Amino acid sequence: QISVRGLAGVENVTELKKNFNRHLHFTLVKDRNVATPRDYYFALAHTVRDHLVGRWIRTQQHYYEKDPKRIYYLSLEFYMGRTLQNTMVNLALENACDEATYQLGLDMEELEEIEEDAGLGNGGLGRLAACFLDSMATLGLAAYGYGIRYEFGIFNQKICGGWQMEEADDWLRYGNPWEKARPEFTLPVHFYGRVEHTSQGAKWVDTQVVLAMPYDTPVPGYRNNVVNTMRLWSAKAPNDGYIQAVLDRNLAENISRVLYPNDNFFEGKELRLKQEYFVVAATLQDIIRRFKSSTNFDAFPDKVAIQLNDTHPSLAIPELMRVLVDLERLDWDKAWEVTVKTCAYTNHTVLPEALERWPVHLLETLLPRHLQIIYEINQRFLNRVAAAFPGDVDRLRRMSLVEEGAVKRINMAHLCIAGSHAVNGVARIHSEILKKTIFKDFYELEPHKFQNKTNGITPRRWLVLCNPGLAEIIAERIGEEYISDLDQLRKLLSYVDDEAFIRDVAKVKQENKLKFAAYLEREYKVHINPNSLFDVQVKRIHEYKRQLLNCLHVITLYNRIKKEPNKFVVPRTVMIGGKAAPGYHMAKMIIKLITAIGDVVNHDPVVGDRLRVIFLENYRVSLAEKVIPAADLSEQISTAGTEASGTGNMKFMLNGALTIGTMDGANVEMAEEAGEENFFIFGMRVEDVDRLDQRGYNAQEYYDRIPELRQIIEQLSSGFFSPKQPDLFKDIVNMLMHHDRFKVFADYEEYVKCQERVSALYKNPREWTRMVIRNIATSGKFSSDRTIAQYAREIWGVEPSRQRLPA
Amino acid sequence: QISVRGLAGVENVTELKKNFNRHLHFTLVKDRNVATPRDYYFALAHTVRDHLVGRWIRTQQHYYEKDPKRIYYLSLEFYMGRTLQNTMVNLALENACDEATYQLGLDMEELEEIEEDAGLGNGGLGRLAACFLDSMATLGLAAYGYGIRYEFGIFNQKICGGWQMEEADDWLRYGNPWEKARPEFTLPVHFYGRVEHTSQGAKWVDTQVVLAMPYDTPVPGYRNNVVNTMRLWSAKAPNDGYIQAVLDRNLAENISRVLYPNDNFFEGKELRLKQEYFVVAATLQDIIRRFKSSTNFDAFPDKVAIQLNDTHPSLAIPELMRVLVDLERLDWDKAWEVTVKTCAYTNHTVLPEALERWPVHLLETLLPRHLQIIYEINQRFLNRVAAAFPGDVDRLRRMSLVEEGAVKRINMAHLCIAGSHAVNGVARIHSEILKKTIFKDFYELEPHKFQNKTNGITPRRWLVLCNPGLAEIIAERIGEEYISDLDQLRKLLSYVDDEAFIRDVAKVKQENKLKFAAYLEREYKVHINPNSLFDVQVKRIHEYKRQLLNCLHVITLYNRIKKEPNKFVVPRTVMIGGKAAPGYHMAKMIIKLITAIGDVVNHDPVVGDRLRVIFLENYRVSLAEKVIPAADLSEQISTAGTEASGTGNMKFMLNGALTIGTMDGANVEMAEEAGEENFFIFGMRVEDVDRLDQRGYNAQEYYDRIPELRQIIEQLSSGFFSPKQPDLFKDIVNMLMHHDRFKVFADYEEYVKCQERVSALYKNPREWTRMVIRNIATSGKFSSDRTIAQYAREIWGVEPSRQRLPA
Ligand SMILES: O=c1c2ccccc2[nH]c2ccc(Nc3ccn([C@@H]4O[C@H](CO)[C@@H](O)[C@H](O)[C@H]4O)c(=O)n3)cc12
Ligand SMILES: O=c1c2ccccc2[nH]c2ccc(Nc3ccn([C@@H]4O[C@H](CO)[C@@H](O)[C@H](O)[C@H]4O)c(=O)n3)cc12
Numbered sequence A, B: 001q002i003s004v005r006g007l008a009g010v011e012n013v014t015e016l017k018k019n020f021n022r023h024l025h026f027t028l029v030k031d032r033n034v035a036t037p038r039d040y041y042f043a044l045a046h047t048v049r050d051h052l053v054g055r056w057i058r059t060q061q062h063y064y065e066k067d068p069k070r071i072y073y074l075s076l077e078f079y080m081g082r083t084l085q086n087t088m089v090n091l092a093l094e095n096a097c098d099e100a101t102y103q104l105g106l107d108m109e110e111l112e113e114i115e116e117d118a119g120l121g122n123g124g125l126g127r128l129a130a131c132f133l134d135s136m137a138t139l140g141l142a143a144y145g146y147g148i149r150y151e152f153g154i155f156n157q158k159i160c161g162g163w164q165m166e167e168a169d170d171w172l173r174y175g176n177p178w179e180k181a182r183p184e185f186t187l188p189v190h191f192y193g194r195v196e197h198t199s200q201g202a203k204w205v206d207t208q209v210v211l212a213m214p215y216d217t218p219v220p221g222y223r224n225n226v227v228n229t230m231r232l233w234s235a236k237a238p239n240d241g242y243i244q245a246v247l248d249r250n251l252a253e254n255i256s257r258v259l260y261p262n263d264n265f266f267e268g269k270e271l272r273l274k275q276e277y278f279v280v281a282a283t284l285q286d287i288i289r290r291f292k293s294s295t296n297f298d299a300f301p302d303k304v305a306i307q308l309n310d311t312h313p314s315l316a317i318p319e320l321m322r323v324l325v326d327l328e329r330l331d332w333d334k335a336w337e338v339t340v341k342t343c344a345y346t347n348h349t350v351l352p353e354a355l356e357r358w359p360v361h362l363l364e365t366l367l368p369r370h371l372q373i374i375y376e377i378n379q380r381f382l383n384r385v386a387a388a389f390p391g392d393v394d395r396l397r398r399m400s401l402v403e404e405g406a407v408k409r410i411n412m413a414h415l416c417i418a419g420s421h422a423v424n425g426v427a428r429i430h431s432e433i434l435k436k437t438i439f440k441d442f443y444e445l446e447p448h449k450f451q452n453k454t455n456g457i458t459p460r461r462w463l464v465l466c467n468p469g470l471a472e473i474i475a476e477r478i479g480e481e482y483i484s485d486l487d488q489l490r491k492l493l494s495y496v497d498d499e500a501f502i503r504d505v506a507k508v509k510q511e512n513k514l515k516f517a518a519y520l521e522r523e524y525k526v527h528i529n530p531n532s533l534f535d536v537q538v539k540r541i542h543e544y545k546r547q548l549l550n551c552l553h554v555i556t557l558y559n560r561i562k563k564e565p566n567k568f569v570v571p572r573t574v575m576i577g578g579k580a581a582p583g584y585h586m587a588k589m590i591i592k593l594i595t596a597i598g599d600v601v602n603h604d605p606v607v608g609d610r611l612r613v614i615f616l617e618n619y620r621v622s623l624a625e626k627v628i629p630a631a632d633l634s635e636q637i638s639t640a641g642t643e644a645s646g647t648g649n650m651k652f653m654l655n656g657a658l659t660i661g662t663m664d665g666a667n668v669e670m671a672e673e674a675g676e677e678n679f680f681i682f683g684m685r686v687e688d689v690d691r692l693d694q695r696g697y698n699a700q701e702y703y704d705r706i707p708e709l710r711q712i713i714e715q716l717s718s719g720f721f722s723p724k725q726p727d728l729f730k731d732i733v734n735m736l737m738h739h740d741r742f743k744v745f746a747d748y749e750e751y752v753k754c755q756e757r758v759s760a761l762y763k764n765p766r767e768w769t770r771m772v773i774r775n776i777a778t779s780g781k782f783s784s785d786r787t788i789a790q791y792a793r794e795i796w797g798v799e800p801s802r803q804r805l806p807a
């Protein structure tokens, strides 16, 4: 149908049809008379999977022969979403499969909707890991993603009476055709026990054993015949009254049962610590085994890079030391040299509630040898600090890995900095904040360690896959090379005054909006005006992300309409979606507020279809792929200094939405790339937030000086949005007035005024679309291919490649 | 190689080789450089599996079109063993696969040894179910086996210091290629709750739901292209703090976690009751669904037969009543008529400790509606008894389904008799005992219900598969038709004086013994004399089976050798194997005694290799297939009246062993078929045991009158077989002397004298072999094809068929 989706060769279509029929018969054990759409989905998945395996075996054989430096990306989350379409895109099979299925009387898009998301992550951190795997494969790096195979991923969100309810995500119920169990490579992981000392050295004895069984999933590069591996560990009990002993195997196996549904927030639970050590211990054995199949660990850092995605896999540092010192019998200083040169750490947030600090008593019980190693690391590190800054005793307590107080804790971020040769933030402003604030002492000791690697997104999933219409009209003008070289989008600046291109860009957006408007009616029985401005904020529900600021604007627009019903206003559909962590009370109340505002606004006859407020249920990767291409306005409105980077922001920019945002995270670099004149920037800068913190933030001042703001707070307090329960939102009002860490009121006036400028521009479709073109054309920097190239050259010491392996 | 293993056609061998290579590459994702024997096993299994699916789909389609009466065999156990070789035998693929694998440089017998037993049973009852499935498919019956997919089957037995240790049987660790998950046919099962009454009728509300997910396994008939289904249910929690709620899903899913390892013994545990209802509830929904796809339940018994394997699935009776009355709104009398005509019950034992009696309070809590239905069944049944036997009040209490006492219980056997149109025992003597003793009252009320169906074994697994050498020399004389018509073995009586046949029979046994003797050294590092008489007792460890009587004989032989070292005695290898239930103390002590006797006997220089005593570890179906073909003497020595049938006895007879046995269970019919002169019969008959019980069994009398018996008891008591722990066997001695329910001493003298006659005959190889031929030749009656033909005609009302379906 469209050129970017590849060729539908006569022979290939014939071969796909017969293999489809083979799988339906032999693999699924069905005939066409009793087959359901789900059976047809699986037949297609197995057919496409077959095209991966030759390349997969060949890739891994190639790495064994050439023995390049291996990159190990350790993460507790890989937010992969669906795999079928992504695989077809990367193998150039999409049109052929479309034709083959069409000839069998099937609609391939219908079959794609049957696949469950692999929701093994919460949000940004987990999705970054997924984008990174795609880019590492596309750039020909010998890269392995290592994590946990959670039996239950992020919960499915239901909205009942306006409230979030959680349901278990039983994503493996119908099977996962993409994974391959590898029980033969199962490895032991140790917990508890005690340390005894001998003439030889320390020994960790009397431990409990849990087995780590790997499942391997292929990760195809973009049309280069490279297929890398994501290896996810599953917990199994070893085989050694009788009935209760067998039933109690669940205790061990619970380690891999469920993803903790926290986003940018730390809770010190023992099961989570077990998960963290589980992935680390199994992974490091696998790394060392692969290295030994190449005595001398001097070459270990030349053959191995370990990238720590946040502090969650930080135990890699003392585990590597444990293995090298206790088992391989290396002296401490040599082991430490190897460890530091091997490990690198990426920080993803400065929010203090998100930093991992584990109680010592927990480590003492669970991992007694690792605690000893951490203490030794700390003593040697602080001796260096003392030599560099003599007499600076406060610095010593500030930099210590051990935090004193009622309960002694280990600061895992401090451990990571000490044991890594490179530490990076994820956007320029964030990396600067790290050096100026929370890691200032460490930067002063070891400035060379500190880097920036601005985040990015894969243009395969986030353009070609989710927005083929846009990818096609771009390809028509500048060819297909931009899909693996996104900087080529700069060529589109030559078409900003091209009347044909302006029309095509606008047409693609309108079609996307019509498609999404239809999807809403089908699945959720809700009607919207497709000519309205689609105003979208999708991301996890958090105070720092300020969904509440969006809510205040929505109520402002509603009140203004009620005040002057017969004045024209630009019609809007305001969509807000995202999950709240189950224990996060305030986040759950914010969801209830949004639906409550919808209940009033959507049923007021005077409003008509000029304003609609919809809460998008169960926001997840598959839904992002639908809503982002349909968006006109991207809401990126975190308090300056709180969103380390953001990546949803980049997805919207690539898909033809304009951005309203604070100068926070990667928004700063996006505005710099596109030009501030082509961005809707408002609000306090980081420096303004600091100044306000110094004199003290008084929300009452804004309430007293802004009548429109006062009206809204009175409406909330009085029960306007909750008639049968007038004090329902008292906690929200109380927070805003007296305990708002994120200064919602301080940015309200500028936000509302900025939103008026958005509406003004939307009234002129041609100039709106020209500004969109300027955004799309300068989105190239935000390819994760660029990000990974920088990690490769500046941290891992390996060169990327776009050369194809032989099929 | 040999004709019974089928043809190795050039095209078939070529096609198997390419499909093998396809599976290794695409299915297993391996190349030949890194493949292990296990990978090669799986490649072969998938290749053979592919040949089943066409026949499997075609068979089930055939049943849908012709709509024959369906037979539902409900069992809590299916002791299937390995599937690969059985499948090859039944599809005539064995030689072709042998050739194909040979050409790829692989030994197929080596690959067969990698497959795990599907050990979803304990012993005789579970293995009977497996044999029955094979025969039902071979006879072209539209038959379905329904059970539970236990995650852990019967434990693996290790012997440590002479003591049994249990290890979990993680049989699904590497995957099960034979099963097909059918998540789309998942069904709900209800527990707990309460009953409320309305104008309409009773309703069972406020229940907890567990999902039953089916897995289907093919069951091929012998070379008739029929492939039936065994459907096993797996327990799943429905999808509706957060973390603990997800972790607590294990509570529901524990229903299908583990097989209770009890053999011929009842324990009233709640989890077991949940297992029993789980299989029943899911199965009956599946039955009714299939029936409705053919309002009118008058025809239900014409289209459905439900066979209850023991009382374990007895809840089918009140569940069927519940569905018909509460959900389908049939009147009670009509529902009862349908239920009785649909259900039939097989009793497998008269031992009182094996009879299922569930406490009322347990049923009241778990299954409150079923308890109500059971009470109503009981009231109506006892009203019939009262009308038939007026004034006989003791009969009323004897026949009641409800047993009074400290704790009220439901007698599930009584429920089964009341709600079934046919009740059968499993051997003639057993069926007679049922009518004369435990079910006498029921026989007097409804004599027409009571039948016999003597057990049998499948000659596919238990001759062709495990003893191809014997199958081949038979086929050479009488052709191959006997494999599905075992009565044709009677033709071998014409060869009892044939010198060539005598030599061949003897040669096959010697080769089997050499092969087994080698297997013992390889796997268990134990040496044996292959020219000795192989004296074998393999079966679960039980007091009623009298492994202890065997032990007494072994010690007698040892003592006689020590008394006259230089006298010639026929050399013996005495092998005893079997598992003990983990809680069965006395059974565990018996195992310890056997190994303790071995420790003394096997290391006494004066004995030499004239007597060896070996405990065969981890007795299971795969080991039975090895040891039975190697046996000379089959020990079937249960106290008369205790072994309902036995089936191991039949396996030995078919494979060229002579039998030493009591007139118990099917031994009676085996001796009748072969002639008593060709059987080593000894000991009390049932009538003798009764007479002894009337005057009272005094073991002291035998001790006082038999000096050789006295010596052994003194040796046991004094610590002869346990020097460092002299009173180790005090419990065994105490039991034998004062509390022996099974009269070990009463049969000792006759047993020893009978064993002397065995030794005498073994000294004359020609006459031994002629007697063997007379046994093999008259084993035809004990084919499970004969058994199933009788169930079909006399209980289910369906005609068997040997006509082949088109491939
Ligand atoms: O501390 C925990 C935790 C503790 C116990 C159990 C489960 C847990 N799960 C977590 C999941 C995530 C996080 N932390 C973060 C930190 C940053 N981010 C986001 O990362 C993106 C990629 O760099 C950025 O674009 C974004 O700005 C940032 O917020 C992000 O998305 N989650 C922290 C935790
Ligand atoms: O009562 C239980 C039970 C209770 C709680 C949990 C698990 C349980 N498992 C059981 C497993 C088996 C049995 N009962 C029997 C009864 C007879 N048999 C044997 O059946 C063979 C086939 O007919 C006969 O050849 C043999 O003579 C007989 O002993 C045989 O092999 N098991 C009873 C139970």
Ligand SMILES: *Cc1c(COP(=O)(O)O)cnc(C)c1O
Binding pocket: A122, A123, A124, A127, A538, A539, A540, A619, A620, A621, A624, A645, A646, A647, A648, A649, A651
């Ligand atoms: C990109 C993405 C995120 C991250 O969005 P931010 O706005 O950067 O927080 C979260 N969830 C999903 C499903 C995504 O695709």
Ligand SMILES: *Cc1c(COP(=O)(O)O)cnc(C)c1O
Binding pocket: B122, B123, B124, B127, B538, B539, B540, B619, B620, B621, B624, B645, B646, B647, B648, B649, B651
């Ligand atoms: C046949 C068989 C049994 C039953 O043997 P009996 O001697 O009849 O109790 C038990 N276990 C296994 C593994 C069998 O093959």
